[PDB]
Design a protein around this nucleic acid. Structure first.
Lengths: 49, 93, 292, 40, 147, 118, 49
DNA sequence: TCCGATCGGTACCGGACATGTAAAGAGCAGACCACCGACAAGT
DNA sequence: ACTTGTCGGTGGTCTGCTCTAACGTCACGGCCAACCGATCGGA
């Protein structure tokens, strides 16, 4: 299973957080299996049905 | 379910701890012998009142008085090269 | 994190009327009580439980049991005989009674809060209800009345206590697995942890050192040495220019001359010639009483 | 009321320690008394 | 997931971060950050500055952000983590062997759990343990308690 | 006092070395060498003595081939050969690569120089 | 402006002036900078190696 | 604007070293080794 | 006639895999305790 590099997540400032515009708490919740994140959503299908 | 489950859970935990707990792996059939020797040593220590010599362990474990030395020498765990030697934090083994 | 002390007082079973009638001599306590924004007792107890143990679903009895375990039980809190004596002397509580209990009590907490508020106001005296009047003043942590001495016996006793705790854990583990009517004292007691702890202390602890044997004076001074370093003590790096000083309370108890001149200056010393040791671990010195 | 909101906030806490998170997850589900095991 | 199943996709763990990076567009994000910094002001401008710093750092070089998520863990040569036999028969270790052993044990257990078909709770716990083991290998103490 | 020269005097030309980084040991009880720390390096740099510093760092501590070549040259009477690459730098490069860092030495052309000489 | 320097960053005066000279000729609007006093630690950590 | 919290740093040489526990037990099978038969074909 | 390679067997030890049916169901052992300046994420 893929594993993130500790240097680029738990750093001050966090580089993954800056790249993805995510707060460090959100990253810690996601990558340590505490919260789900929507990777993508089909907006075209939702707007039709 | 709490009886069969208990049996299987205990077996799995014990077998895994026999395998994945030593830097130098020892087979389960010898980990059992080491544990038995330790238990017999504890019982002899309680009974005699002094530290039991290899002679007593040989009689109470129905093995040769030489295999006990090999068993005790297989139980050594390697030390770490990164442990501090002095009082401050500038020296290592 | 910080929480107003009124929440803690209400969680201890007190009400608004109790706080008003108890701390009615002050102003900061009233201001804190007006800004508590928490009424009743259950709400404050739930807030304390949420702050102390996040992530655990709270119930009614769990918070009370947690508070009792934290402060008012012998299992996980132990103000030792030294600590009990110091608290009694400082707050003027239980004057005369023998030192039997060794745990904190609500009376001690309320006395501490009252002492703090009266010290902040500026009063130089305070009498706890059902207590003896004591002066109100700040404490110097470097005073020799606030620094005690753990001798060899106390360190060995602590190691024996650790070993006995491990042995008790093993005994409790073995009690529920063996069959009743066949359990005997010798089939439950594993003596190995106790002797292991003693050996670990004598062979690993920083306070157990090789004897100096250059000359008789080396050994004599080695046995009379007071060290501030070790388990539960300071470190040679995390110690500023405050503890490495000759306090005026060292007269007749600690020598101001004999100390290492390297990086351990002031952290190691020697007993004076006439100095003794109290049963509580404090250092006593003799004086001749004069009259008229 | 306040108790339900406190419970909901407690269940949504981060709980950075892994052991605590696993204990919460296993405590989410209930047990089986005598008969549900046979059905399963 | 039950009701509106075929309308979105959600993930959990480092795979989610990998997919987000795959769908990430460096050029558009950098252009938006530049527009914000040349138009906006206040506390937004400082965050735009820092984000633009990182995004332009990734854009200038020929590398890709995908290197922040690992699919393989390199292993140092044995002579830099020696297993030597001290005189008297006692051995010695370099404290890296233990970390590598933990990583390998958790990876093998994860492989077995995935092959068996264990419930998602056990698999998620094993993946979290593998992540923690790799983090302890690279930097022991940054997150959580030291091993 | 218990500070006698008999317990203080120590000298070495060649002796035991370490394992990970092929540097001489330390201490009189192990026939070790004297540390040439960072302050001494600053003093040498201020003096302008480039060759003394280079030989001290390379052919007296880490250059595995250089040490034996220097000893042979001294014994046979030839000139001291040129220094090589210290082993500590290669150890550092391996430790950096083990952290998923792509450290590579580039020549003038722009290619990569392999460190697997031998 | 039309330089490759990221805004808010600290750049050498020589490089900044050279870039401005290269931009004003056969280019567009140059960048504007303001002198910065830096501590010893920050200046030593801001090196090019 | 104030606000807690994490994270970085703190001179040099000389010397000095190695851990303390285990709830077990059985039945079955493959592998390698130390001892041996035949047996015709090759020496 | 003696040797020699392929065939087949008995017995022994080291190593690994599988199984055992009353009922049993949500971890600890423990500090931290300097003290400075810088800085990002909150309020």
């Amino acid at each position: 299973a893929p594993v993130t590099h500790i240097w680029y997540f738990k750093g001050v400032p966090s580089r993954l957080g800056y790249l993805l515009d995510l707060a460090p708490k959100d990253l810690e919740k996601i990558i340590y299996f505490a919260a789900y994140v929507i990777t993508s959503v089909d907006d075209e299908m939702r707007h039709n049905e | 379910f709490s009886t069969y489950a208990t049996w299987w859970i205990r077996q799995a935990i014990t077998r895994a701890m026999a395998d994945q707990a030593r830097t130098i792996r020892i087979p389960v059939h010898m980990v059992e012998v080491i544990n038995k020797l330790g238990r017999i040593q504890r019982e002899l220590l309680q009974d005699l009142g002094r530290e039991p010599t290899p002679e007593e362990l040989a009689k109470e474990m129905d093995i040769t008085p030489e295999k006990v030395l090999e068993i005790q020498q297989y139980a050594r765990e390697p030390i770490s090269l990164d442990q501090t030697i002095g009082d401050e934090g500038d020296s290592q083994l | 994190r910080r929480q107003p002390v009124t929440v803690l007082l209400k969680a201890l079973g007190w009400t608004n009327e109790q706080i008003v009638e108890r701390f009615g001599f002050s102003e900061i306590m009233m201001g804190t009580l007006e800004k508590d924004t928490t009424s009743g007792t259950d709400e404050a107890l739930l807030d304390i439980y949420r702050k102390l143990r996040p992530g655990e679903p709270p119930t009614k009895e769990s918070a009370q049991t947690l508070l009792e375990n934290l402060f008012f039980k012998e299992k996980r809190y132990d103000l030792a005989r030294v600590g009990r004596y110091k608290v009694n002397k400082k707050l003027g509580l239980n004057a005369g009674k023998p030192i039997t209990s060794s745990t904190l009590t609500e009376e001690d907490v309320v006395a501490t809060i009252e002492y703090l508020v009266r010290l902040h106001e500026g009063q130089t005296s305070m009498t706890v209800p059902g207590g003896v009047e004591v002066p109100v003043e700040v404490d110097d942590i470097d005073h020799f009345g606030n620094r005690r001495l753990r001798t060899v016996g106390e360190l060995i006793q602590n190691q024996i206590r650790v070993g006995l705790s491990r042995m008790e854990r093993v005994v409790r583990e073995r009690m529920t697995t063996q069959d009743v009517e066949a359990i005997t004292p010798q089939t439950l007691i594993n003596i190995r942890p106790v002797v292991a702890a003693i050996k670990e202390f004598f062979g690993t602890s920083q306070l157990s050192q090789f004897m100096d044997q250059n000359n008789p004076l080396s050994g004599l001074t080695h046995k009379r040495r007071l060290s501030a370093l070790g388990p539960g003590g300071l470190s040679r790096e995390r110690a500023g220019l405050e503890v490495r000083d000759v306090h005026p309370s060292h007269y007749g108890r600690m020598c101001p001359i004999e100390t290492p001149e390297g990086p351990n200056i002031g952290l190691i010393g020697s007993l004076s010639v006439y100095a003794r040791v109290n049963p509580f671990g404090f250092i006593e010195t003799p004086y001749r009483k004069v009259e008229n | 009321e306040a108790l339900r909101q406190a419970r909901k906030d407690a269940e949504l806490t981060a709980s950075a320690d892994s052991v605590r998170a696993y204990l919460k997850q296993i405590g989410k589900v209930a047990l089986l008394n005598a008969e549900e095991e046979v059905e399963l | 997931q039950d009701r509106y199943g075929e309308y979105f996709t959600g993930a959990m763990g480092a795979e989610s971060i990998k997919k987000l990076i795959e769908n990430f567009d460096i050029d558009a994000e950098a252009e938006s950050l530049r527009e914000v910094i040349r138009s906006g002001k206040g506390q937004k401008k400082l965050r735009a500055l820092k984000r633009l710093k990182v995004v332009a750092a990734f854009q200038q070089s020929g590398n890709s952000p995908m290197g922040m998520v690992l699919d393989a863990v390199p292993v140092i040569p044995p002579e830099l983590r020696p297993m030597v036999q001290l005189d008297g028969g006692r051995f010695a270790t370099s404290d890296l062997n233990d970390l590598y052993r933990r990583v390998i044990n958790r990876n093998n257990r994860l492989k077995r759990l995935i092959d068996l078909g264990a419930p998602e709770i056990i698999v998620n716990n094993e993946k979290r343990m593998l992540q923690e083991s790799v983090d302890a290998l690279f930097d022991n103490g940054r997150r959580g308690r030291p091993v | 006092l218990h500070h006698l020269v008999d317990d203080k005097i120590h000298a070495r030309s060649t002796g035991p070395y370490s394992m990970i980084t092929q540097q001489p040991l330390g201490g009189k009880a192990q026939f070790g060498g004297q540390r040439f720390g960072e302050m001494e390096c600053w003093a040498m740099q201020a003096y302008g003595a480039a060759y003394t510093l280079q030989e001290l760092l390379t052919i007296k501590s880490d250059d595995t081939v250089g040490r034996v070549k220097v000893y042979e040259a001294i014994v046979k009477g030839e000139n001291i050969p040129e220094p090589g690459i210290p082993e500590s730098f290669k150890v550092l490069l391996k430790e950096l690569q083990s952290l998923c860092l792509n450290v590579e030495v580039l020549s003038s052309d722009g290619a990569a120089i392999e460190m697997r000489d031998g | 402006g039309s330089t490759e320097f990221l805004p808010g960053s600290l750049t050498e005066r020589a490089e900044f002036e050279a870039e401005n000279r290269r931009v004003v000729a056969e280019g567009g609007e140059p960048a504007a900078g303001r002198p910065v006093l830096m501590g010893i630690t920050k200046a030593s950590l801001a090196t090019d190696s």
